[PDB]
């Protein structure tokens, strides 16, 4: 018959209030933050993460295009050549070869430029 | 509660407000929602469902409780000090255990923090039979057919 929620009460608040970043103002001191801001964090988080899979892809091809074209054939023609092959088709991402193994990449543009019928 | 008066706070106006009586389950002052009454609690079990499955102890506490001896007749008028002598006959002492001799004699001498309980008579419920380690059935012959009541 003793609610005295004060116990769990203090715990619940302290839980969410534990937003290190402190964000700004009431977003830490005041409990108002939680479902107001801490909730937003969870929201902005749910989409941005799995969404980013493309943000980098948009980047990969963005640089992959800026690299492969510098020496004939643009991104549009590139993958098209790479497209033709029995097994030859190592996807992008590592395709950033243009930054480390330049020679390899430029040696990979031939695998497409000369590949294009 | 000590609610001595009807709403005296002017409803409309006075900025923030809105209230009535003061027993008001919201007013820290006092007044508790739907209180709580003495009630009865006491639920009743059928007569048959009562005797059902009780002294199952025998089979279960086989190697423990299911012993039958005597109510210790030679026990002095009112003495518990030497109850131990009689306790060692089974080596079962503070191991709780209840007796069921069915004779409110001087054997009700068992008085302690919580160990041996007499209650040697028809009046007995499983709660006790289970609250102890070795319910010394004893009594002798007392146990019969459907009415082996101890």
């Amino acid at each position: 018959a003793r609610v005295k929620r004060g116990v769990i009460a203090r715990a619940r608040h302290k839980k969410i209030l534990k937003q290190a970043k402190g964000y700004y103002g009431a977003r830490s001191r005041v409990y108002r933050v939680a479902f107001q801001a801490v909730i937003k964090a969870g929201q902005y988080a749910y989409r941005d993460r799995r969404q980013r899979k493309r943000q980098f892809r948009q980047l990969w091809i963005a640089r992959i295009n800026a690299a492969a074209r510098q020496n004939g054939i643009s991104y549009s023609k590139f993958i098209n050549g790479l497209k033709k092959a029995s097994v030859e088709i190592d996807r992008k991402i590592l395709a950033d070869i243009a930054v480390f193994d330049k020679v390899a990449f430029t040696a990979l543009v031939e695998k497409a430029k000369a590949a294009l019928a | 509660v000590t609610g001595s008066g009807k709403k005296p706070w002017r409803q409309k106006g006075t900025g923030r407000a809105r209230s009535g009586s003061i027993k008001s389950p919201i007013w820290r002052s006092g007044g508790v929602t739907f209180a709580a009454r003495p009630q009865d609690h006491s639920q009743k079990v059928n007569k048959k469902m009562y005797r059902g499955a009780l002294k199952s102890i025998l089979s279960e506490l086989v190697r423990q409780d299911r012993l039958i001896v005597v109510e210790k007749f030679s026990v002095e008028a009112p003495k518990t000090k030497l109850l131990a002598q009689k306790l060692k006959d089974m080596a079962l002492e503070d191991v709780l255990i209840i007796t069921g001799e069915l004779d409110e004699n001087l054997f009700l001498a068992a008085r302690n923090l919580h160990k041996v309980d007499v209650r040697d008579a028809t009046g007995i419920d499983p709660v006790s039979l289970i609250a102890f380690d070795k319910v010394v059935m004893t009594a002798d012959a007392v146990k019969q057919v459907e009415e082996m009541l101890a």
């Binding site: 980098f56 980047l59 963005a62 640089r63 800026a66 510098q70 590592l94 950033d96 930054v99 | -």
Partner: protein, 140 residues
Amino acid sequence: MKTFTAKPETVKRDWYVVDATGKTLGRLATELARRLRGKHKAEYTPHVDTGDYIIVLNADKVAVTGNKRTDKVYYHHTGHIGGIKQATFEEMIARRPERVIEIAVKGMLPKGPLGRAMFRKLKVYAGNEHNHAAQQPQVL
């Protein structure tokens, strides 16, 4: 690992010199906006800080295509009520290629901070290689 070349803090800076006196006028802006970011560049990933380093010349040798030599509106309104709006057709402004025409790239850049880092930081001028108050060193 985490494939993504870090932010070299705009470590690369290749100097160049266009001609301005070309035959594409407005079409050129793109090759400039693209350059001032990550066009002929492969590594130095865009989005993050970066850039290049090119430079315009006379520029006074443009005429667009259609009768755009008479339009281009142009009105650099100034928050000052009292009825602003400064309409000045292209040819009317081509008189002094300043924050306009050659500055047609500003509207083509990411805009705001960082993108604004490139902006006019490419120089313009209007006389070709006669008087280069800009850097004389390495160029192409």
